[PDB]
Design a protein around this ligand. Structure first.
Ligand SMILES: Nc1ncnc2c1ncn2[C@H]1C[C@H](O)[C@@H](COP(=O)(O)OP(=O)(O)OP(=O)(O)O)O1
Ligand SMILES: Nc1ncnc2c1ncn2[C@H]1C[C@H](O)[C@@H](COP(=O)(O)OP(=O)(O)OP(=O)(O)O)O1
Ligand SMILES: Nc1ncnc2c1ncn2[C@H]1C[C@H](O)[C@@H](COP(=O)(O)OP(=O)(O)OP(=O)(O)O)O1
Ligand SMILES: Nc1ncnc2c1ncn2[C@H]1C[C@H](O)[C@@H](COP(=O)(O)OP(=O)(O)OP(=O)(O)O)O1
Lengths: 673, 673
């Protein structure tokens, strides 16, 4: 029943040594725990050969790509990994890896993989034939310069994507098909979310008899019950609906029998017409999209509301409903101050930067609230009858370290290796239930790249998070990685000799995304910011001009390359801080079980004490200015989590919303307290 | 609560497959148990260096002789051991080694040493400076051609002898000193036994007042109580004592309050005078050794009974006691049929072959009943007063395989390596409580060498144990190992340039032990026996003549070289049968715990089924003839365990005793039932 030594060492960290903390007690809490637990619970082997034979015979890996190398090359990459002798600085480093991310035994009572082993296997999977590229993947990974996504780093050749975005058409067979597809993907752990802007409203005529539609809320109840059969999902709605108030009745603070959501996150996508109508404080008009489909031929989200609003107003066919949009703004701010629900997307601001607007307009995002692509709704008829194959969205993840890239300065080769690995993931992944997402991943070849450790690295350098220096740092750095990513995508579309589909209507084929970058040089205007960027060439606008000429020469390979997700589940094993969102506490405190670990921030001392600020005590306006500074280079959206408190008010949240709509911010996340 | 797989596989061995047993179910009972238990409970290491650093820092070994080699040489002998990849054929092989003989952790919940590791460490300890000799020790050990003794193989350089033989003088200070010395050695696990032939009888005058001695039985009670303070011991008595009947009252079948022995084994050493007096069926005379000491000046066992018996008879000074020795023979046979107690030694028959009879006569042996050397009783006065340092006996152990030597045919180099290792053990061992045994081990330099797997190897070749072929086999083989052992001892006394002490009065300095061997060639008289010995030169009498000339040239190093002990505790890990005693069962059956292992004999099939006979169904006369055939080459005694039954009678046991006295048999062991 006795607490072991390393847990007591972690308890000893919080002992006030002259007003500070016993940080080095972590290390023994590392070092004893390696000795007393890790090295005493590992399965013994006599060599590498019998170890690999045990891995083969005990049915733990796909043996094919493992047999794409010799045993000597496998031992070479293993010796290369073990030549690091990686010394974990954090208790949570080993305390999450060998606890969760490491592949253990079948009874899960001993250790199988080491920290080098999983990384080397993932490197052999990413390289898939080459030994030296796998060693480069190791050097990108064993120095923690890159970290792949959670199922990607988890089940590389074992027994894959957490981003899925679909639509729904207005037929019962479509409803059953979508229910089936969500149940198919729910067992695979992928993040599946949708949007319901193409369904008929409550109390409408179902094709023969008047006043027959039970409403969308029954379908939401059905999907909420359907998600109770697996381990989660989400759905959206365009704002100009009569049941949009009922869309606010979903996440009601009085949890009803008739409305009881537990899994489906909601998010209201607001075009500029609604903030236009609420800004003038004039009464607005939502409509019936089935009457719109019966009158004009298309759904309401098929057309822009700013054009066709008065065209719906004067036309007597589509039935009206008149409300106050300012009261809806008040109730939205009220629900956001209650919880932080729902999400808000400025889809016109998304299309204001969207390169593939020639295909469609983005009208929704994921649960991770980051991916913004084009889409097409399918249509499913009966079983004997033939159906349709629309367009879908699937964007893989995987982050890098700002700190390790900025210290090791292999940034272009980092872009090379990360792009090749994400290309390999997009190539290998296949879906055999809904062929629409299969066709979409086959057609778009879309990837998503992000990064972490912004506040911890820059605050570790002695730079405030609320500095314009850090904003210019993000500006120049993401200009450089934008240069390298577009350079790599154009090189890859050259080397393949082939680009993604509908590349010609995008801004890359016309060079319009580079039109911002052929002028307006984002060279560092601050001295410490430039000195951090010293040691490497900063690409100017002429480099962007040659990049534009090379893109117009061949083409670009990925319709999207970048997304930013809250990838906080891997910061501990990356021995690093979170993503570009600033930290909340200098010391995380957890009760693991029968214990209290006290994990401080990595690099926490008294010099960066006030550089490691608190998220409850920051100006959010400088944060969204930084968000816009980063969004100057990101194609897709960024999951900006709002860091708020309980004492704030709804009208200041409204001012934040007007400020973000003024900044052209794409999406927002659930708020803090 | 479920029985694991390998135990069920061992249970599957006894399943009657067409009247036989499922022998190969052992192997999976090996092989799964290696997989499911052994390789899952070993402490992980990254290399050899950190493993040795853990062994150093965790205080597991004497680091000095380990630092007498480079890390590369240690890795060379480790690679040499692991290049064997020794495949255990028996369940009891791993089931005793990694259970008991392997050094485990401090909490004893994981494995530290491997099967190669302990052997290689023992080899480095035996070599103590040389790498190649340690590899030769490995090849002698990893092929199971030699096995050292239990503490020697156990604690080689860790945190030593099981043979100790002392005497007692007739003073209270001597009694307290001997009690102290036995208590000193009892905590060290050594086998300590004594003899009480120099104490005054019961009811005698203690130096001033008549009828004051409480008797020897109180001292035996005291030693029995004293052995209750540690984890065992023994004591003897010469037969011509008045309390010798009381010596039979010790192991009384009615366990008394007043006599309650639980640890002290007894054994009556019978000279030829007693079998002379019992043979003629005439009344015999025991005496009072204190009156003998007061009259003639010496104890009774100082002089021969055959000479001085009538000189004690006609002298009126020494008080007589007249008994029937045939009734004592009857009661001795009765107690031997009850249990098997006590032991019987024909000390005149021992001195009939004893080379160092110029020193003294052997009057006692150990609990292992094998070692027969010369001795001198000490005398201890008061604490301020000065004492005496007599002579003692300490003979180390360690056996070899008849099977592996007879198959690998490195018999002379086996003698070389075994003699050098036993020399190293005798050099390193030191005692710091009783300096008499320290002086005795420093002076005699006496070793003991034995062997095992006689019945199993020869019966595995298709030879009956009750054959004269096997007797001639033992004759020729032990002639050859006698040749090689005397050759090695003479070579060693040449290389040192120095022999043991009082070598000149021994028969080796006069060549009288070779006088039996300069004639009477022990070449094999049987064809299969010779064909087993074919492939190597058999030394004739001329080789013994050159050996005699080389011994007379320099000298011999060890006063004794050979002893045979029941070393059955290591046959399982040696994957072999017992010593030269024949087997009792073809299949040992044990209930380990919550289980029933069924370990057959190694090599048990239907062809050697009737070669693997049963010890209850053999002629003991052929066995003692084989014993005499072996004793034709052994210097010391051999622990011949009597294999008897319940249905036999005491008079046949008497005929066995007369037959063994006719054969010149030195000692006998406790009998079977
Ligand atoms: N931070 C850590 N990261 C990885 N392994 C560790 C860490 N801390 C302790 N250990 C491991 C390595 C060893 O197997 C054991 C502790 O030995 P350690 O001294 O840390 O390594 P080492 O063997 O390279 O150095 P040394 O030769 O001084 O013992 O547990
Ligand atoms: N009995 C019903 N109760 C509730 N909803 C129904 C019922 N029958 C059909 N629906 C729902 C599910 C459909 O998405 C929606 C439209 O009805 P359905 O007849 O299936 O579409 P449809 O393809 O034949 O053409 P239309 O859109 O004109 O109705 O109403
Ligand atoms: N009799 C045995 N003696 C020693 N080790 C054994 C024995 N039986 C099984 N094992 C050990 C060796 C391995 O670590 C594991 C079982 O693998 P095993 O097949 O026996 O050895 P191996 O690796 O040399 O052959 P293979 O390449 O065919 O697997 O447990
Ligand atoms: N009070 C006693 N009770 C029992 N035994 C005793 C007693 N005193 C002495 N002894 C025993 C232990 C001795 O071994 C033995 C001889 O007595 P002790 O006086 O100690 O010997 P000693 O060396 O003085 O010469 P001696 O042999 O003539 O007696 O008798």
């Amino acid at each position: 029943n006795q607490v072991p030594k390393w847990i007591q060492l972690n308890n000893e960290i919080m002992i006030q040594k002259d007003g500070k903390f016993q940080f080095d007690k972590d290390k023994e809490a590392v070092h004893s725990y390696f000795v007393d637990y890790i090295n005493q619970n590992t399965v013994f082997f006599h060599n590498l050969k019998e170890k690999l034979d045990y891995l083969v015979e005990n049915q733990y890996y796909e043996e094919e790509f493992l047999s794409l190398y010799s045993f000597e090359d496998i031992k070479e990459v293993f010796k290369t990994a073990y030549a690091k002798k990686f010394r974990f600085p954090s208790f949570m480093s080993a305390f999450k890896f060998y606890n969760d991310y490491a592949l253990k035994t079948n009874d899960k009572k001993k250790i199988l993989e080491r920290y080098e082993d999983r990384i080397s296997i993932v490197a052999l999977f990413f390289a898939n034939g080459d030994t030296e590229k796998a060693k480069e993947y190791v050097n990108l990974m064993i120095n923690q310069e890159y970290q792949p996504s959670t199922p990607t780093f988890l089940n590389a050749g074992r027994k894959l994507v957490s981003c899925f975005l679909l639509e729904v058409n207005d037929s019962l067979n479509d409803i059953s098909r979508a229910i089936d597809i969500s149940m198919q993907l729910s067992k695979l752990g992928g993040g599946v979310s949708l949007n319901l802007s193409k369904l008929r409203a409550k109390g409408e005529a179902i094709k023969d008899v008047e006043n027959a539609t039970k409403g969308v809320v029954g379908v939401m109840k059905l999907l909420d019950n359907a998600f109770r059969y697996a381990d989660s999902g989400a759905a959206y709605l365009n704002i100009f609906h009569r049941d949009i108030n009922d869309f606010l009745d979903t996440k009601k603070i009085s949890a009803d029998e008739d409305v009881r959501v537990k899994t489906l996150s909601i998010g209201v996508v607001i075009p500029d017409k609604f903030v236009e109508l609420a800004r003038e404080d004039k009464a607005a008009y939502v409509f019936y999209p089935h009457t719109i489909y019966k009158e004009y031929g298309q759904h309401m989200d098929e057309m822009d509301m700013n054009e066709m609003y008065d065209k719906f107003v004067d036309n007597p066919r589509v039935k009206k409903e008149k409300i106050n949009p300012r009261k809806l703004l008040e109730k939205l701010a009220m629900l956001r101050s209650e919880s932080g629900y729902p999400y808000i997307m400025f889809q016109d601001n998304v299309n204001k930067v969207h390169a593939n607007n020639h295909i469609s307009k983005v009208k929704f995002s994921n649960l991770c609230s980051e991916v913004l692509q084009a889409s097409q709704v399918s249509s499913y008829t009966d079983y004997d009858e033939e159906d349709e194959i629309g367009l879908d969205i699937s964007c893989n993840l995987g982050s890098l370290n700002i700190l390790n890239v900025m210290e090791h300065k292999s940034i272009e080769k980092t872009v090379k290796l990360a792009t090749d690995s994400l290309t390999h993931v997009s190539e290998t992944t296949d879906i055999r239930n809904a062929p629409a997402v299969r066709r979409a991943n086959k057609a778009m070849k879309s990837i998503g790249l992000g990064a972490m450790n912004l506040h911890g690295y820059l605050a570790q350098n002695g730079i405030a998070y609320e500095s314009p220096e850090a904003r210019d740092f993000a500006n120049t750095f993401f200009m450089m990685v934008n240069f390298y990513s577009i350079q790599r995508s154009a090189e890859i579309a050259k080397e393949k000799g082939e680009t993604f589909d509908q590349y010609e209507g995008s801004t890359y084929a016309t060079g319009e995304y580079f039109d911002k970058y052929v002028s307006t040089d984002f060279s560092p205007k601050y001295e410490k910011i430039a000195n951090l960027f010293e040691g490497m060439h900063i690409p100017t606008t002429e480099d962007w001009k040659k990049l534009k000429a090379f893109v117009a020469e061949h083409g670009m390979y990925h319709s999207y390359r970048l997304c930013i997700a809250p990838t906080g589940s891997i910061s501990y094993v990356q021995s690093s801080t979170a993503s570009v969102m600033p930290i909340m506490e200098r010391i995380e405190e957890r009760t693991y079980g029968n214990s209290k670990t006290y994990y401080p921030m990595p690099g926490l001392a008294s010099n960066n004490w006030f550089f490691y600020k608190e998220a409850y005590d920051m100006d959010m306006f400088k944060v969204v200015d930084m968000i816009a500074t980063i969004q100057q280079h990101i194609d897709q959206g960024i999951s900006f989590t709002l860091f708020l408190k309980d004492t704030m008010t709804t009208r200041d949240l409204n001012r934040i919303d007007l400020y973000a709509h003024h900044r052209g911010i794409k999406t927002i996340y659930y708020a803090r307290t």
